[PDB]
Every structure is written in C-alpha cells, then in structure tokens.
Amino acid sequence: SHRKFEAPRHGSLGFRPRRRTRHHRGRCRSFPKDDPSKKPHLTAFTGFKAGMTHILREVDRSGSRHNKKEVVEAVTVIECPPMTIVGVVGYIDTPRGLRALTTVWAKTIDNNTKKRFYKNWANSNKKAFTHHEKNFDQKAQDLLLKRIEKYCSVVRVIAHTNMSKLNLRQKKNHILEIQVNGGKVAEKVAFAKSLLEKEVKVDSIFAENEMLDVLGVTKGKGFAGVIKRFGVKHLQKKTHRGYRKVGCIGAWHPSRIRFTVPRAGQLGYHHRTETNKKVYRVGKGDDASNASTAGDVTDKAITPLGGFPHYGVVKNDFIMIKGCCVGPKKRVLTLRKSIIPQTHGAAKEIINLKFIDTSSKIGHGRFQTVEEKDKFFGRDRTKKVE
Amino acid sequence: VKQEEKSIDTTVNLHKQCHKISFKKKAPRAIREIVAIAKKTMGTDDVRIDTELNKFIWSNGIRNIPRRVRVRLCKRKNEEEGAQSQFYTLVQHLQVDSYHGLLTEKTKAE
RNA sequence: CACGGGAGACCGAUAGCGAACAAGUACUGCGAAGGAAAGAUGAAAAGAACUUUGAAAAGAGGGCUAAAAGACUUGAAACCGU
RNA sequence: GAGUAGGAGGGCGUGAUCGUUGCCUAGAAGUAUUGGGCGUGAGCCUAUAUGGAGCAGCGAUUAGUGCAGAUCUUGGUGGUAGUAGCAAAUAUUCAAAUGAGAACUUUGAAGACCGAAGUGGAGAAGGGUUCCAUGAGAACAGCAAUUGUUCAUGGGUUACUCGA
RNA sequence: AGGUUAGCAGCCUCUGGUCCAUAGAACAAUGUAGAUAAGGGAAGUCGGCAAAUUGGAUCCGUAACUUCGGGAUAAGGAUUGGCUCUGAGGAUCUCAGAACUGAAGCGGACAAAGGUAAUCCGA
RNA sequence: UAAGUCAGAAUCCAUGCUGGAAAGCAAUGUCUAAGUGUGAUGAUAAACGAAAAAAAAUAAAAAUUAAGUUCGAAAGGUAGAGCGGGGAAGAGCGAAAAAGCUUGACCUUAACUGCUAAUCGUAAUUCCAAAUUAUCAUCUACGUAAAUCUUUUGUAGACGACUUAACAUGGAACGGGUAUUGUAAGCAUGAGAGUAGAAUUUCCUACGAUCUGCUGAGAUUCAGCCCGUCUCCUUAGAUUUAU
Ligand SMILES: [Mg+2]
Ligand SMILES: [Mg+2]
Ligand SMILES: [Mg+2]
Ligand SMILES: [Mg+2]
Ligand SMILES: [Mg+2]
Ligand SMILES: [Mg+2]
Ligand SMILES: [Mg+2]
Ligand SMILES: [Mg+2]
Ligand SMILES: [Mg+2]
Ligand SMILES: [Mg+2]
Ligand SMILES: [Mg+2]
Ligand SMILES: [Mg+2]
Ligand SMILES: [Mg+2]
Ligand SMILES: [Mg+2]
Ligand SMILES: [Mg+2]
Ligand SMILES: [Mg+2]
Ligand SMILES: [Mg+2]
Ligand SMILES: [Mg+2]
Ligand SMILES: [Mg+2]
Ligand SMILES: [Mg+2]
Ligand SMILES: [Mg+2]
Ligand SMILES: [Mg+2]
Ligand SMILES: [Mg+2]
Ligand SMILES: [Mg+2]
Ligand SMILES: [Mg+2]
Ligand SMILES: [Mg+2]
Ligand SMILES: [Mg+2]
Ligand SMILES: [Mg+2]
Ligand SMILES: [Mg+2]
Ligand SMILES: [Mg+2]
Ligand SMILES: [Mg+2]
Ligand SMILES: [Mg+2]
Ligand SMILES: [Mg+2]
Ligand SMILES: [Mg+2]
Ligand SMILES: [Mg+2]
Ligand SMILES: [Mg+2]
Ligand SMILES: [Mg+2]
Ligand SMILES: [Mg+2]
Ligand SMILES: [Mg+2]
Ligand SMILES: [Mg+2]
Ligand SMILES: [Mg+2]
C-alpha cells in the first residue's frame, strides 16, 4: 500500500535521540567565526532566567505593518551578575582535532569556585589549589603564557559564575570556557592576561538592539506519552487499548522497528541553542531607574511587584530579550554571540522603548508600584514608618 | 553529648504538611506527619500521640483538617520494664485562640 | 461361582486382581454408575538421657547402636545450593 | 569395499528353566567415578567410594528380552519468576492492656457506613454440630494474627395448648 | 422509625449492626472510572456510536392525522427563593391576594422526556 | 573535450544543531600512609645484529640500471689496560601520539697481557636482554584526600539517575509583601414592606428578609510565590575508593 494521504513526518530527526542532557549550563560547541578584524573580544557570557514581562515600544521599521505605531511585545528578563575570570587555556590544532595545551590559573580562586571540585565544601578540608598557592611563581605563569603565544591556535578564558551575588540555594559557582576572538594570537593572550582575577560585565560583551544566542536546558517534562512527545494525531476515541498510542509501529518488512517511528520516552531536559534573540535592554543593577523610560520619567525597577515568581528580586544587572527562551525560572543560561554577525532587518532595527511593565505577576496586577497600591488604599508606608 | 528530657512547643501546619493529599487519607496522613516531626525534632523512634491531639486532628472529619495545630513535644525517660530506647516523645494538644503570634520555642515554666 | 487342598519354567509394589495397606475403601455423581493413591528403622526402641542458646520450632554440645539406618534399607536421573 | 525401502551372515546385553564350573558378613546385588584398561561396535574387566544380602561363568532350554521420540502412560522436575499479580462493595485513627511479636486481638476515645427495599430482628429449603465454654504447637483463615466457621477437650436442643 | 417528598424514590439521620475486603510511599507513560474546554457545531464516523440537550410542579398555548377512543407533557411560552401582611374552604390541612428584598438567583443537592417531518415492516 | 580551463542546481560535502558507554584522546584540582622496598612463581600472535631517518622527482640531469646498500659483529669469564660506550643534578632546546636531543658529576668498556675453559664425554633452546604486568609471601608506614548510605533541595524524577545544601543564605514556625475571594463574627438609640401589644393620643415596645456604618473587611496565600527573622531541629553513625 502506498500510504493513503501524504503528511510530513512527526518530529525532526536532528533532535534525536530524545534523551536528557549531560550539559547543564550551556555548551556552545561552536563559538562565533573568529575574525582578525577586531581586538580580542569575549565570545559569550552567563546569566539566569528571572521572569517575563511585556513592553510597549514604537516601531521605526519601514515597510512593516507596524511602522510608526505602538506595539506590545513579550520579553524575558535574564539577571546577569558579573563573571570573574580565573584562567587562560591554550589550544593546539592536531590532526585528530583541537587539544588543550595548558591552563594558567591565577592566585585568586575564591572558595565558591573551588566548590566546583567538591560535592560538599564544608565536610572537606578544602585542600583545592593549595599547592598552586604556596608554589606560585609569576615567572612560570608568564612562561606558560609565552608558551601559548608560541604554539597555540585558539585562546579561551576560564570564567567564573559568582553565585553569591544571587539569592538562590546553589552557591557553588560555574566554571566556563569563553573563547577569545581577536586578530593575533599574541594579543589574544595579552587580553586574556589583562582579564585574570578581574570581573567582566555583560556590557563588556552585549549591546542594545544587538542580536543574541541563548544556550541552555529545556524544562524537564519527564517520561512522555507519544502524543505529547512528537505530537502524533490521537487514535479514534473508540479504541480498545487506548487512543494515546501511535497506530502502526511499522510494516511487516523490515522485521524490526525503525529509529524513525515515534515512541514513548523522556521529553524535556535537552540542550538547545536558540538563535537570533533581540536585546531590548541591558541595565545596571544600580539604576533604580533601570525599569523606566524616557517616556516614563518615574522610578522603576524591573522586579515586578511581589517579585518575580519562583525566582526573586533582581538586584544585579540584566539583559532583557525579545520573547521567551529555554528553561524554567532560575536556570542558568549561556548567552553567546551570533556565529556570524547578523545583518538582517530585525537586527538593524533601532529599538524605542516606551512602557516596561512592573505590574505584579503573582495574580492579575493593576499596580505598577507600591506607592500606587498605597495611594489607592490610603495607606502610606512612609507614614507608618514615621 | 548527653541526652536529656526536653520539651518544645510548635505549630504544625496541616494546610502545608497535608497539602494536596487524597481526601480519604488526609486526617490519617496528618498524624503520620506529626509523628515524623516528632522524630526529626526529639530524635526518638518511639513517638506517642496524645488522645486529645488525635481527637483534634479528626475533629473536622477526614477530608477537611484543622489548618494549624499547636503541639507540645515532650521527651521523657523510658521507665518501662522492657526498655528499648531510653526515651519516648509525647505529642500533646495545646489549645490556642489565634495561632498568629506563635513561634517554635522551648516550653516555658508556668 | 463359594468354602476347602496342593501345586507353577506365572507377576514381584507404575508388575501382579482395581485393591500386599481401615479396597470396591477415600472421593465424585440427583441417579444408573465411577473409583484411586498408599508395602520394607533396627537383631532388639535401645525412638535419642543430659548440658547449653532460644518465646517456640529448632541449633550447638553430648549419647544409643555393628551403623544412624532416626522416620526411617539401598538412595540413580532431571533440577537446585556449596 | 557407496546405500534409503528391503534381505541375508555373524555378534553384544537382559530375565527364568535343566545342566556344568564357581563367588560372597575376610562384604553379594545395586549405585558414583577427572582411577587403569579391553573390544570397529553393541558392550567388558578392573580400582576406589557407598552399600549390607545375595551372586556369577560355561552348554543348552524358553522369552512380557534392549526405547529419544508415538500432542505416547504414570511419577518427579525445571526456565519463565520473586515475575503477572494480591486495585469493585466509599475508612479509618489515637491511648491503654495482653503477648516473643499487634496496621489486622480486647476496653476506651474519635471519625464514617448499612440508613428499617438494612450491613438489623427471625424463619422455609439446603447444611449437620458449624451453637456454648476453656485451651492451642503445626496446617488452613491466598499480608499478618496473640484471632477464628480452624485444632483439642468438655457441654448444650425439656412442650396437653408450636409443628409433625 | 425521623427529615425532605407525590412517594416504601433518591439524599441525611435514631434503634440495631458494621469499618472485613493486605499495607506504606511516590505520582511518569499507558490504562479503568469520574468531570470541564475558548471559537465552529457532525466538517468526526458505515452510522450522531458516545456524549450533550431535555426534564418536577403551576399558569398559558397546542397541528396534521384518526378506527373519534386518540394524537397529547404534541409543538411551543412563562413561573418557581426569602420575607411581611391579607382573604376564602372546615370541627365541638388545602386555595388564592398584595407588598418588601437579593449579583434576575430560587424543581439551587437529590429526583427528572430532547423535538419535528417523512419512508418500510408488524395491527 | 581528447589533454587543459569558466560558469553552474530545492543535489553532495561541509558549516550550524542534537547524541556521543568511540570498553577514543587532552588540559587541569586534590589525593595515592612507607620505602629508585625485597622474595618466589608467571603471562605478552611473537628478542638473539629480529640492525639502519634526507627531502623531491620519474618525460629529470653535467653525471650515477636495484638496501643486490651501509654500519655493526672477537670469550653468555676473571685481573689489568682503556680506542670507545652510556649517562646525576642543574641549566639548554623539543609538542601531530613530548619521542627525546645537548652539556654534565660520574658509571663503564676494545686492541694488547696473565690466568680460567677440557669430564656438559660424537647433537637434543645457546633458558641469561628490553618493555610491560598477574599472583602468593613478607619488611617499613596504623596516615592523607574524597566519595556514598542514613539527611537536604525540586530547576530533576516510574525506580536508579540529575540540579543543589551541609550549624545555616538549610529545614520548621512566624512577621511583612504580593495575590484570590468579596466585605467575617459582633454591635448600632441608623434604614426596613407590614403585623401585634402597651402608651399616651402627632409615640414607646416586640417581631422582621433586607439595606447601611464600623469594614476594599474577614479568611487563605509554598507544600515547586517573594522579602525577612528573636526562636526550634539538625555537629552523630555506617560505608566506599586510592590500600
Ligand atoms: Mg517526505
Ligand atoms: Mg567545531
Ligand atoms: Mg508544543
Ligand atoms: Mg496491557
Ligand atoms: Mg514491647
Ligand atoms: Mg510485657
Ligand atoms: Mg542436636
Ligand atoms: Mg552408613
Ligand atoms: Mg550445579
Ligand atoms: Mg520376567
Ligand atoms: Mg567389617
Ligand atoms: Mg560375558
Ligand atoms: Mg564399609
Ligand atoms: Mg544363552
Ligand atoms: Mg526403559
Ligand atoms: Mg524416556
Ligand atoms: Mg513450573
Ligand atoms: Mg485485578
Ligand atoms: Mg458486609
Ligand atoms: Mg439476616
Ligand atoms: Mg440472627
Ligand atoms: Mg496503596
Ligand atoms: Mg467547545
Ligand atoms: Mg448551531
Ligand atoms: Mg456556542
Ligand atoms: Mg445515544
Ligand atoms: Mg385530549
Ligand atoms: Mg410543554
Ligand atoms: Mg406527533
Ligand atoms: Mg415571590
Ligand atoms: Mg401570591
Ligand atoms: Mg423580585
Ligand atoms: Mg435550574
Ligand atoms: Mg432523535
Ligand atoms: Mg410487534
Ligand atoms: Mg568549478
Ligand atoms: Mg539523492
Ligand atoms: Mg435595629
Ligand atoms: Mg506567611
Ligand atoms: Mg507533601
Ligand atoms: Mg522563605
């Protein structure tokens, strides 16, 4: 039988097998094409998913349905506290592929990062890096860096997510490789060195109206029936075993089931590299103004009234992206630059922000600020304080 | 360490502890929950639930359970002939008007 | 066929009458009628005194006896543990 | 010097009978063998261990005389497998007591059900001691049990007017 | 037996009986049973299978057809609580009025028909 | 088009992306108690120079047809000699799988000289090197780092697994915030269709659904909300790897 009516297949094979991921923070298995063009720049950065809100902007984009009008768009806020830089890593090109030549550690590696090497810090004598400390010889380090200059193709910085800046349970930092793209190996190295034992800010990396990539883990949905997993059409509701099955696992020949036919299994907790997310804002955890606009002219912090649900208050700096990104609130994410710098329209679009909603998300909120709720109910907390 | 007779007043939150438990099993499960809080706190594998406390848990039937209980945890020397643990914990029902001010505390001399 | 006698190039406990035995029995079927399984401790009970650990079964000591042969002669195979 | 169907000639191994030659409480038969050998092969001899009363050769006589099968008979055992499963009939909980041991026994304290078309009180048919009391090892009561419709021991069924 | 009720229905109770159905914990897929889905409204399917709608009582209103019995709850349209008063039916418990009051709800659970027009059989 | 060249597809290969127990590899943190500890027995699809570094070109060149080369090669001893051979430390260089090359305390050895070879009886592997590693036995060290279970989190979950915490930035309880419902109980010398009684004759009293004020109240709100806390519980035990 030639199958009766032809419809497309029920999942993308490039997304299988469907099992869970080993990579918990993002893993970029490519860093953007390297160009000699520009001084060495830092390739990606790490952040955490805080919440969503909506925005009212005005569109200058010409030819669009929306030219010169107000649009409201969904937005995700990602808290981006400063990353620390710990080490440098040289890579050699070998006929079997790239290889790690060496890692240059600083003198300063703070306890929380050391936590990485341990399952529990406090029941341990905390012996990590001791020998690197007592034996530390700046000369040797310089020698290693010179080494890297001599033999190396690629240079990456070993980077430090400082978790102590957030309020979450996990205090144990994150240890990343962030590759360095810049013209000459030597300068890459110089740069890397300049970085050691210092703190890097998201501004250093990402700009506004810049296009982003987000790397991370989908929310885990556990063991999934076939309908939820690949979205098969459900069988006739009259069906004897049950209807949430696929009807035919396969034809007689071949004598087995192909890897292509959908089946039960795990859905969720995969790694995704999502491309071309726009940066609507980058803001400093210092501005109490950071959530407001030229159009607003009043104090606003991005943190929604009653705080981001299942996340917290955002005291640190942040990036605010157009739309949604992978994973549940509090999932760390790696924001990487676009493999090739994006030249298309949406990427050129200059963004004019008018409203940023600070309204509570725990319910349907009508108050943008405590001051508002209070004026409304005639309770002054500044009055109760007095 | 020495292990001494102890007593501690605490509000168990049944709304929380029993949350989303199947109806026919709520009340009973409230009890197991109390009993476990006894164990974790006093470190006694012998816990005893006072009649009154039980009565109060069940005072609303199985489905709908009082949302808070003020309890006293007594730790006492096990003076029995057959003696397994040196100690046992009595869970006692304390009557309250408003639970709203309460903390977990060492029972106070009155 | 019944009660007796004696015998056999019969059979020898899945054989020989169905029944070596509380066998036309136990058991089944409204009923007419159906109908099995089941023999061997040792010469002699001498059938395991007593000590010990166990709530108890039982174990470990200790003993009977030519031997534990101990719910019982020999003790194969399949299967199972070391 | 091939060989199915088939036929012929020799031989191996098993009861019992008439002979003949013998072996065994100084250990027969049977049984186990990674002990030693004999036959091309049916099969044989020995050794060691176990066993504890009968055996064996040779010549003939006779046959209920050789099994891998027949969805073969009867009996005994595997893998599946500590798997399928133990989910109808709304429900249980606390303290004390008893016991080696208590979610499953007894008292009390709570919460629910049958809701007088009953999960109540009594009969006919059918059952036949299942009734009562005391006691209780195993088995049975598909978890459990200190409990029982189970086991052991004793005891219970009174009529002129009920029925035959 | 009581309450509700047309009711020996259902639902809830008192007398009497019972908690006996192996248990604990997690809470995935698939399932068994139970419900609810914005917009459309059988496009699903051999087929409206299944589900949904309807449902009591009082007042209105009620066709063709016909064996004049029927059809007939035809079809269809309204009302239903609470509270404060008023009048009528009887002996030596029913019925009707008026006013006020609520998120215009009120047979609030329980109980409880979906219609219509044709064709074929068999009275 | 035969050599030789350009253009050139939703194709192919890559790039990007998901796996990646490929019984693949690298960089790095800490630890491996005590010694470049010894003894005996063993195994390794293959030890007896199992010897050996130009690069490139095959229609090149002035000129060489074969690794059909070159180097090493003496007694599986002793005593001297010493051409020569091998190398500590440290300092140099060296990365495609860092294999090693230089220097160098020092360690060693060939000609030549003397002993020693014979009875291993006319053969029977010429049992010795190098790189690895198993087992048993023992001497010294009785330590160090880390993990797991009994906890914890819900960013995960059928169970394992996973993210994360470890005397408190944890868990409990509580305070505040945010939010849902929609104005709780109790009062009222306030309103309320209308009725009854007293009272005195333009009222009092009782009953009364409901309205109104106190009241945008009351209740609930992490068990997978947010912020915070004086208080309470967790400081123990067992196990595993290098041993
Ligand atoms: Mg296709
Ligand atoms: Mg790559
Ligand atoms: Mg989807
Ligand atoms: Mg099935
Ligand atoms: Mg006891
Ligand atoms: Mg006792
Ligand atoms: Mg014994
Ligand atoms: Mg014997
Ligand atoms: Mg075996
Ligand atoms: Mg015979
Ligand atoms: Mg003898
Ligand atoms: Mg013979
Ligand atoms: Mg013997
Ligand atoms: Mg013969
Ligand atoms: Mg046979
Ligand atoms: Mg056979
Ligand atoms: Mg079987
Ligand atoms: Mg079943
Ligand atoms: Mg019953
Ligand atoms: Mg009865
Ligand atoms: Mg009775
Ligand atoms: Mg269960
Ligand atoms: Mg719908
Ligand atoms: Mg319609
Ligand atoms: Mg509609
Ligand atoms: Mg139907
Ligand atoms: Mg009529
Ligand atoms: Mg009608
Ligand atoms: Mg009609
Ligand atoms: Mg009315
Ligand atoms: Mg009226
Ligand atoms: Mg009205
Ligand atoms: Mg209605
Ligand atoms: Mg119809
Ligand atoms: Mg009919
Ligand atoms: Mg080309
Ligand atoms: Mg193709
Ligand atoms: Mg009043
Ligand atoms: Mg609270
Ligand atoms: Mg819970
Ligand atoms: Mg908190």
Side-chain angles (χ1 to χ4, degrees):
Chain A
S1 165
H2 89 89
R3 124 208 241 169
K4 192 155 213 210
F5 299 119
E6 215 151 332
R9 71 158 290 108
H10 267 297
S12 163
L13 291 174
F15 294 72
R16 313 199 183 179
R18 201 131 202 179
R19 53 201 188 209
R20 316 171 178 173
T21 310
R22 61 184 206 200
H23 321 284
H24 297 91
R25 66 201 166 172
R27 154 204 178 169
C28 15
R29 48 166 150 196
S30 319
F31 286 71
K33 297 312 185 192
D34 197 352
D35 188 326
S37 74
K38 247 190 212 166
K39 295 194 170 176
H41 57 285
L42 264 186
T43 298
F45 197 87
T46 308
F48 307 73
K49 183 167 210 175
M52 298 197 64
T53 281
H54 46 158
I55 291 179
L56 175 83
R57 54 171 238 213
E58 181 158 9
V59 258
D60 88 319
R61 187 171 182 29
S62 64
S64 204
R65 184 115 206 161
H66 312 282
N67 206 174
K68 301 206 188 174
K69 319 167 187 195
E70 306 203 330
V71 185
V72 173
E73 295 178 357
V75 136
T76 297
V77 159
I78 297 194
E79 194 165 8
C80 288
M83 299 228 301
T84 278
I85 281 165
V86 190
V88 194
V89 164
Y91 280 97
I92 288 177
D93 198 344
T94 134
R96 17 202 208 153
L98 260 61
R99 193 191 119 221
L101 195 43
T102 292
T103 302
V104 177
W105 295 107
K107 271 199 188 189
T108 293
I109 299 178
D110 47 354
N111 301 307
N112 290 331
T113 180
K114 295 182 177 169
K115 232 184 180 180
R116 214 56 212 191
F117 296 68
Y118 301 109
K119 280 233 168 123
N120 93 335
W121 188 236
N123 272 318
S124 63
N125 290 315
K126 300 167 208 230
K127 274 317 177 165
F129 274 116
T130 318
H131 290 265
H132 191 247
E133 305 195 16
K134 73 181 182 185
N135 307 328
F136 182 108
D137 194 336
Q138 178 49 22
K139 82 185 185 190
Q141 311 284 338
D142 293 336
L143 299 172
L144 296 179
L145 311 191
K146 286 179 191 163
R147 275 197 152 181
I148 285 168
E149 286 190 14
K150 183 170 170 193
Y151 302 81
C152 286
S153 287
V154 178
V155 189
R156 304 177 187 182
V157 177
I158 287 189
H160 196 266
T161 265
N162 323 79
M163 287 291 326
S164 49
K165 304 219 145 195
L166 302 189
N167 213 317
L168 293 180
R169 195 164 222 255
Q170 166 187 38
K171 284 350 204 172
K172 141 184 212 169
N173 303 292
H174 303 262
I175 297 181
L176 281 190
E177 284 193 30
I178 307 186
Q179 174 169 307
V180 187
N181 287 6
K184 316 172 211 168
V185 200
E187 336 194 326
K188 295 196 186 180
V189 181
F191 185 79
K193 204 183 175 199
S194 54
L195 292 177
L196 293 134
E197 295 177 28
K198 286 177 188 164
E199 285 181 355
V200 203
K201 283 187 171 195
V202 188
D203 331 348
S204 187
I205 313 180
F206 295 122
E208 290 195 10
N209 309 20
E210 184 180 349
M211 295 296 308
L212 200 51
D213 286 349
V214 171
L215 303 196
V217 200
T218 63
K219 318 150 85 177
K221 291 158 183 180
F223 201 97
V226 52
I227 280 175
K228 176 161 199 173
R229 199 161 212 234
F230 318 110
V232 164
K233 181 144 272 172
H234 73 257
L235 309 176
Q236 187 168 33
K237 303 221 202 169
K238 206 175 171 200
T239 284
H240 175 39
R241 311 306 178 165
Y243 65 101
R244 313 218 81 201
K245 325 166 163 220
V246 47
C248 173
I249 275 328
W252 196 328
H253 295 305
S255 279
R256 339 111 225 169
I257 308 163
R258 311 200 194 190
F259 68 105
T260 41
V261 12
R263 292 217 126 188
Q266 170 122 41
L267 174 69
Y269 216 94
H270 319 277
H271 182 97
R272 304 290 157 200
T273 291
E274 205 165 337
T275 209
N276 283 180
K277 312 244 139 156
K278 181 83 126 170
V279 192
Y280 281 141
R281 198 187 250 185
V282 180
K284 327 308 176 187
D286 286 336
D287 268 351
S289 69
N290 66 17
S292 43
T293 312
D296 218 321
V297 189
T298 301
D299 290 356
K300 246 191 199 161
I302 315 86
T303 317
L305 219 49
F308 283 98
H310 294 126
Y311 182 79
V313 156
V314 172
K315 296 184 190 181
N316 279 129
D317 319 335
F318 68 99
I319 301 161
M320 189 196 60
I321 312 178
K322 172 177 184 170
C324 63
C325 79
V326 329
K329 322 272 188 150
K330 297 180 285 197
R331 198 183 259 19
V332 321
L333 307 164
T334 300
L335 316 179
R336 150 193 129 188
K337 290 206 155 184
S338 357
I339 43 156
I340 309 162
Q342 286 294 17
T343 186
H344 64 288
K348 301 185 140 181
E349 198 181 32
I350 325 157
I351 286 311
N352 189 351
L353 287 186
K354 292 231 167 163
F355 181 87
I356 286 188
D357 180 283
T358 55
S359 181
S360 160
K361 315 299 179 132
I362 290 184
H364 316 272
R366 49 119 193 270
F367 299 116
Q368 295 282 313
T369 16
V370 162
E371 289 67 21
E372 279 199 359
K373 180 150 158 169
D374 278 336
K375 186 174 173 173
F376 187 79
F377 292 62
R379 319 168 188 174
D380 204 338
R381 326 190 162 183
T382 325
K383 175 181 184 184
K384 298 298 179 171
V385 175
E386 85 200 347
Chain B
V1 191
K2 182 185 185 181
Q3 203 162 345
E4 296 197 9
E5 289 191 326
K6 213 177 201 174
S7 62
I8 303 179
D9 293 9
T10 271
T11 315
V12 181
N13 201 301
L14 290 183
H15 208 8
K16 314 180 177 174
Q17 305 285 359
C18 269
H19 162 100
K20 203 60 180 146
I21 279 155
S22 28
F23 277 11
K24 115 198 185 185
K25 308 179 190 183
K26 270 210 173 162
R29 168 73 163 236
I31 279 203
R32 291 245 183 74
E33 279 302 336
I34 287 150
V35 166
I37 295 148
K39 286 182 178 172
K40 287 175 192 179
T41 296
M42 311 286 70
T44 330
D45 280 332
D46 170 313
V47 179
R48 295 173 185 152
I49 298 290
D50 190 30
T51 274
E52 297 309 329
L53 187 82
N54 179 51
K55 185 163 173 187
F56 175 92
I57 294 305
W58 290 79
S59 89
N60 264 340
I62 298 209
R63 298 180 180 191
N64 313 328
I65 269 174
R67 290 140 168 204
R68 318 244 158 156
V69 200
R70 191 68 169 162
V71 177
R72 256 189 204 176
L73 297 183
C74 241
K75 195 183 182 173
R76 290 182 181 166
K77 297 182 181 181
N78 186 359
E79 197 177 349
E80 301 300 1
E81 192 177 357
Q84 296 308 354
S85 296
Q86 307 176 357
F87 304 92
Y88 71 97
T89 316
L90 269 200
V91 176
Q92 289 183 349
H93 175 69
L94 297 191
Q95 311 193 18
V96 176
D97 292 333
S98 65
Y99 295 105
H100 267 319
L102 298 176
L103 284 176
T104 292
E105 59 199 17
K106 306 235 172 156
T107 61
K108 292 219 162 178
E110 311 183 353

